[PDB]
A paper describes a structure:
Pseudoalteromonas fuliginea sp. PS47 is a recently identified marine bacterium that has extensive enzymatic machinery to metabolize polysaccharides, including a locus that targets pectin-like substrates. This locus contains a gene (locus tag EU509_03255) that encodes a pectin-degrading lyase, called PfPL1, that belongs to polysaccharide lyase family 1 (PL1). Polysaccharide lyase family 1, PL1, is a family of primarily polygalacturonan/pectin lyases that catalyse depolymerization through a β-elimination mechanism, resulting in the formation of a double bond between the C4 and C5 atoms of the sugar residue at the nonreducing end of the polysaccharide chain. PfPL1 is crucial to initiate pectin depolymerization and has demonstrated activity on apiogalacturonan. This enzyme belongs to the largest PL1 subfamily, subfamily 2 (denoted PL1_2), which is one of only two subfamilies with characterized members but no available structures (subfamily 8 is the other).
The 2.2 Å resolution X-ray crystal structure of PfPL1 reveals the compact parallel β-helix fold of the PL1 family. PfPL1 crystallized in space group P212121, with unit-cell parameters a = 48.50, b = 58.13, c = 149.08 Å. Residues 25–458 of the recombinant protein could be modelled and refined with no gaps in the protein backbone. The B factor of the Ca2+ ion is comparable to the average B factor of the protein, indicating that it is relatively well ordered and thus may represent a structural component that pins together these secondary-structure elements at the C-terminus. The VexL structure is a product complex with a trisaccharide of α-1,4-linked N-acetylgalacturonic acid occupying subsites +1 to +3. An overlap of this structure with PfPL1 clearly reveals conservation of the catalytic arginine residues, Arg220 and Arg235, in PfPL1. Taken together, these comparisons suggest a Ca2+-dependent mode of substrate binding for PfPL1 that is similar to PelC but a catalytic mechanism that does not rely on metals.
Author numbering: 25 to 458
Write the structure that this text describes.
């Protein structure tokens, strides 16, 4: 209850500790020096080895010259402390074999620079929760979260991968590879991807736990304007897929809820698939199995799962290991209202209050149909979406400074107004978004 990572944390990573018991680290520069990272920069902060909450007394775009690989856990990245808001560009932040990490109110937008990379990834970790973040403009995949234990991605925008870009192997507009050992993916908007929205990992890619623990819950997400495929994969992995919203856009070719790949080591009750709303297909909506495809063999094509196939479970599945911290599942109607009308998704606060940047705002408005989409809606470059990087950054620079004379990461003016509590960094950070 008070062990929760934060007030509305849910799903299998909801009890992640992050850096709640650590030092405060203030990032006060947008610079990056991969060779000698200076104190006060993101690279230096994330490479520290002690428990830490990283806060931001700076706003705008951090142009990474190289990836940051995060190996040391007990980390909270409190992106909502930034006066106007932080975007990480140029190279990915890659979490690798780490424990207890909370990441909130952060933007990861690779852009078209020198790497054919993801915007962000988390791998081989455990006790991870990512909340209210925005991911976009990748060359490899936008956001990849696989082979982690006790993981939650919630209330995030994963959108607008770069399709025909600079990847060696050709066009490559992919949402991400999602999987884990009890991993929740809930209340997310996944929009404008040629494919992999997400690609469910299954037991693949050198897992550090055995395949009978590969277990994913995917619920209350909105997938919009996928391309040739949407959700697919999950070889020999189980999953619940409940009360998601599927809304074809002008690029969408596959009309399905999932493309289940060949899974010889599971013969019954591999997935539970129910309550999903397919915009513009009343038959899939009324009976979800009409949108479920299965691959008979390693090289078989997509065909409709046969209707009495027991691969599909009658009841919601549960992981076989430990606490079933499954997320609360709401109706598809409430989900649409919350993410698209209330816009309670993505990096939607800074230290000065609510704020959804123009890129995220456009994406949600296009989902809703209140703003038009040019063509298929699958971009090849962020420069179709922004005039220039310098121009995209300006919007984050026009918010009032957060005065922090004593350098404790607490807004001096909030300290003056909360005397009995003025040194409580947790209570200050909660105040920002509550
Ligand atoms: Ca202060």
């Amino acid at each position: 209850d008070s062990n929760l990572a934060f007030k509305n944390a849910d799903g299998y990573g909801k009890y992640t500790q992050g850096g709640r018991d650590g030092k405060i680290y203030i990032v006060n520069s947008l610079e990056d020096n991969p060779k000698n990272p200076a104190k006060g920069t993101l690279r230096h902060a994330l490479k520290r080895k002690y428990k830490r909450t990283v806060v931001f007394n700076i706003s705008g775009v951090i142009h990474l010259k190289e990836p940051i690989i995060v190996k040391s856990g007990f980390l909270t990245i409190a992106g909502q402390t930034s006066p106007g808001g932080i975007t990480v560009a140029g190279a990915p932040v890659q979490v690798s074999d780490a424990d207890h990490i909370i990441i909130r109110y952060m933007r990861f937008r690779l852009g078209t620079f020198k790497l054919a990379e993801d915007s962000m990834s988390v791998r081989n970790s455990r006790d991870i929760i990512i909340d209210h973040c925005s991911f976009s403009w990748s060359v490899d995949e936008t956001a990849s979260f696989y082979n982690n234990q006790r993981f939650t991605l919630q209330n995030s925008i994963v959108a607008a991968s770069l399709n025909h870009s600079i990847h060696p192997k050709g066009h490559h507009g992919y949402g991400g590879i999602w999987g884990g050992n009890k991993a929740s993916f809930i209340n997310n908007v996944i929009a404008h991807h040629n494919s992999r929205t997400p690609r469910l990992n299954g037991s693949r890619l050198k897992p550090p736990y055995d395949e009978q623990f590969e277990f994913v819950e995917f619920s209350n997400n909105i997938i919009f304007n996928w391309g040739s495929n949407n959700v697919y994969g999950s070889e020999n992995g189980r999953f619940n897929l409940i009360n998601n919203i599927y809304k074809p856009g002008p690029a969408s070719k596959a009309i399905q809820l999932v493309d289940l790949w060949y899974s010889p080591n599971i013969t019954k009750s591999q997935a539970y698939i129910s309550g999903n709303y397919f915009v513009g297909d009343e038959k899939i909506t009324a009976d979800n199995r009409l949108g479920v495809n299965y691959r008979t063999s390693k090289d078989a094509k997509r065909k409709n799962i046969s209707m009495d196939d027991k691969r599909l479970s009658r009841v919601k599945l549960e992981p076989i290991n430990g606490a079933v911290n499954s997320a609360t599942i709401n109706s598809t109607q409430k989900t649409y209202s919350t993410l698209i009308k209330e816009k309670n998704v993505g990096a939607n606060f800074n230290a000065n209050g609510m704020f959804l940047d123009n890129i995220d705002t456009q994406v949600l408005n296009q989902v809703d149909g209140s703003t038009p989409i040019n063509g298929k809606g699958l971009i090849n470059s962020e420069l179709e979406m922004i005039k220039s990087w310098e121009e995209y950054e300006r919007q984050f620079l026009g918010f009032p400074d957060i005065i922090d004379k004593n350098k404790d990461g607490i807004n001096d003016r909030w300290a003056a107004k909360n005397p009995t509590n003025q040194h409580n960094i947790n209570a200050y950070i909660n105040s920002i978004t509550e």
